[PDB]
Design a binder for these strands. Structure first.
Ligand SMILES: [Mg+2]
Ligand SMILES: [Mg+2]
Ligand SMILES: [Mg+2]
Length: 95
RNA sequence: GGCCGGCAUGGUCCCAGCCUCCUCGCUGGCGCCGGCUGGGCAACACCAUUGCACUCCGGUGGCGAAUGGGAC
């Protein structure tokens, strides 16, 4: 499904075989064009693998990145994007 | 990776080859057979997982592996 707009986009269906550091970098490579990125959170734990949170400084960036990159073939798999259900700490830690 | 027992095996050195979860080594290891046993998930493989976080954190596996020449 999905939710309300947010500064952060929740990505899943990501190739689980890629290491944390490389995954982070390839994501900046792919998403930096949509706007400034505050951070990318990735974990390879049993619950969080195959998922990533890309935190943009501006919601419009997240909105554009979500429309443009939906299903983008990344590491041989169709990337799935939704707005994150809750604000990330970096974002709340500001406003 | 460690230890043990059996059979085998003349020594020292040189070169090359090979092996590998104990990285690969410029203090590595490498005769045949059998048994006991340690560490670790860091890498790799498989299994399982489609998962909404801001706390590093599923499991199993392999090391049950690896030889030729020369000089004295
Ligand atoms: Mg004996
Ligand atoms: Mg001789
Ligand atoms: Mg010889």
């Amino acid at each position: 499904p999905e939710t309300r707009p947010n500064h952060t986009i929740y990505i899943n269906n990501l190739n689980e075989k890629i290491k944390k550091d490389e995954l982070k970098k390839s994501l900046h490579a792919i998403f930096s064009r949509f706007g400034q990125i505050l951070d990318i959170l990735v974990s390879r734990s049993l619950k969080m693998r195959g998922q990533a949170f890309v935190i943009f400084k501006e919601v419009s960036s997240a909105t554009n990145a979500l429309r443009s990159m939906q299903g983008f073939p990344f590491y041989d798999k169709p990337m799935r994007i939704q707005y994150a259900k809750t604000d990330s700490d970096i974002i709340a830690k500001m406003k």
